[model samples]
Target chain A: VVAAAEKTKQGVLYVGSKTKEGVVHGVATVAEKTKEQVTNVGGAVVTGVTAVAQKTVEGAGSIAAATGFVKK
Target chain B: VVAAAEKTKQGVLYVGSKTKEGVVHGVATVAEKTKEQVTNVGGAVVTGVTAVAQKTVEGAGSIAAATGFVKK
Candidate 1:
């Protein structure tokens, strides 16, 4: 493509994690995204966080706790 | 997987975050990427933010300590 492959800082990233007692399960996106992608990616992010929070809020209340990602 | 699964703004997002003090961990990308993705999504009329110049570097140095995203 004619001069269309320039790299830009205007990229998006989707990162979500869950933690308990310092242990963590995190997924840092290893790529870049555009603003439009940002809108779409946001959905996955929100869903992921909500899913994790559900488990965490319930688990952290008891003794013996653990942290981790809920799998993509 | 017809249409290559369609779900794409171009699809690339990698965010990194590490906090040292402010208890802030910003991943931001939470995803989108592509010039074509723009041409496709932005068949636009309003465009978007065009120009900017806020030299935070204008004055930064005399600090004792601080905190914020340092790793991810």
Candidate 2:
């Protein structure tokens, strides 16, 4: 169960990072921002955001599972 | 199964949004940026990023469950 949870946590993080990257890139393009700027600036922002976001989800999932709110 | 997936999607989004907000705020503070600036700029950025991030995770989870890689 612990291993599964950890696997899910990493999996979610990978998905979230890629997702946020596309979102930032799309929004930057819509705003007429430079690709280089998005690559450099927005890339770091998305990385940090999604990393933390995954942890938040992981923690929440742990609590929910522990409390019998969800299956483990 | 569909409803559970949707519930998880929205739940993840909410957690991701809040997590990103904290991350952005902390980064802004470390850079001596104003809270108002973070609220205005970082707020929207977090919203857009996390919304997309959740959708990505949701889609991936659906595929995983369908493939019997994870439980539904």
Candidate 3:
């Protein structure tokens, strides 16, 4: 159920350049929502999610650098 | 098990600017590894991870933009 929700939103990030505050706000907001939902599942589930989330951030940074969004 | 693994990697991203290819390559590399591990957990887990991963990428773009990496 929750996984499906996450899967559905993938396209939004891949398109192109976007607002900085918007992205941060959205991630922070969605993460909280995800946190609540995953909470019902268990602590372990959330922990794994956290790891992936962090990695995703790093990945994006690289993507940004690659795409020329961020300076080297 | 996996959650802890993801959480552990969070710090690498938060520091100063990083290489573009390095980030993407690292992400691509990690995602594969995560896919294998999460596969055992189940499709639902992977799907959710994917969602978060995508969102994380977008978030980084925003972070990059805010940091003035990419021209808004």
Candidate 4:
């Protein structure tokens, strides 16, 4: 999984994920969350999900699915 | 494998790649080429080399090498 962050506009941010399974999780927008706050939360989610996915896929024939998170 | 591109001073640009084999290809400088052109050519090489290396390594014990490309 990979994570990226960007500010869309003042006080507006977007977060999302894309799965290696070819599923793109919908983008999520939040208001009033500071950039730092959003980054921290999104990063945590990305790291956690990536670790789990990698572990589960290891030696499992092939990784047919993956997930990532992002903040903007 | 990874590829990166960047515009240097004025009309100079650089493109390079790093392989999964841990070899970093040198950056190539070009003048007068549009950003799109440089990106297209550089991206093609990166993709082609990565595909070849990946296929060669597939099912081959473990991957102990990598490479990539970059431009600046």
Candidate 5:
């Protein structure tokens, strides 16, 4: 997995295999403002947030409601 | 995967097993403002974005450029 910030406005996350056919299996965004808040919390919020999103996608439900599907 | 928000402004997504050794496999984030826009768009932008992000991470490049590697 990889994480990056775009234009300082968005937080970008990448996940997938590390092979020649490496296909981007998932993508996520975290706004700059949100990241700042997380930093303020002095916590590892980034990893925590990614975990929830991933579960939602892998779950039975479609991606549309993935976020809501998983319980916080 | 797990999804949770820290402070109302930041959205967090977590990925990995829910077991004890379920170590965090990955993490992603979505800002409060962007999420609101996504909700307004009536689209599954979070999941869509996640897919793209995953691909980038899985690719050969490191996590930093993972987001940029994938196509929007």
Candidate 6:
């Protein structure tokens, strides 16, 4: 059960693109949520579901694809 | 073993960087192939299929490594 992530729910979720506070908040929020999703959808042996999600976004694009996101 | 992509088949697969059509085509082709590979290579418990891959290119130079995929 790899985290489906279902989807990001704007204010309800922190994608970290909103603002400075959003950046820190985003990580905490995403980090925790990611952990939860990981748990609820935990897999075994080696994160098989993990593999599913990875493949889903393979070569999809860099986070930089977001125009305003700065690379530091 | 992971897909390893076993090496890109070129022109046959879409890595996305090339063009809009390629991105769409690449995803479709890759999507099916990935699903096939995973089913055939199902792992136990979790998505170990995923872990192995994450470590794969941890420091793999960017496509810029291709001389190079530029950073945004």
Highest TM-score scorer: 2
In order, the Cα lDDT scores of the candidates are: 0.22, 0.26, 0.22, 0.22, 0.26, 0.19
Lowest summed lDDT window (length 10), candidate 5 chain B = B62-71
Off by over 4 Å in 4: A1-72, B1-29, B32-36, B41-72
Segments in model 6 whose C-alpha atoms lie over 4 Å from true places = A1-18, A23-38, A42-72, B8-72
Give the per-residue lDDT digits (tens) of candidate 4, residues A1-72.
Answer: 222222222222222323232221222233342222111111112211111111211121221112233223
Q: Alpha-carbon error at B4 in model 6, in Å?
A: 3.0
**Candidate that would win on DockQ:** 3
TM-score of 6: 0.14
Q: Give the chain B TM-score achieved by candidate 2.
A: 0.14
Candidate 2: residue A21 Cα off by (Å): 15
Candidate 3 chain A worst ten-residue window by lDDT: A35-44
Candidate 3 lDDT over B1-72, as tens digits, reads: 111111112212222221222211111112211211111121122221122333454322332111112223
TM-score of chain A of 4: 0.17
Candidate 6 CAPRI-style tier: incorrect
Off by over 4 Å in 3: A1-14, A23-38, A42-72, B1-72
TM-score between candidate 1 and the true structure: 0.14
Better of 2 and 4 by TM-score: 2
lDDT of 1 by residue, A7-35 (tens): 22223334433333332223233335543
Displacement of residue A31 (Cα, Å) in model 6 is 17
TM-score of predicted structure 5: 0.16
Better of 1 and 6 by lDDT: 1
lDDT of 5 by residue, A1-72 (tens): 223222211233334322222223323445753323221111122332222233222211211111121113
In candidate 6, residue A28 scores what lDDT?
12
B39 Cα displacement, candidate 5 (Å): 22
TM-score of each candidate?
0.14, 0.16, 0.13, 0.14, 0.16, 0.14
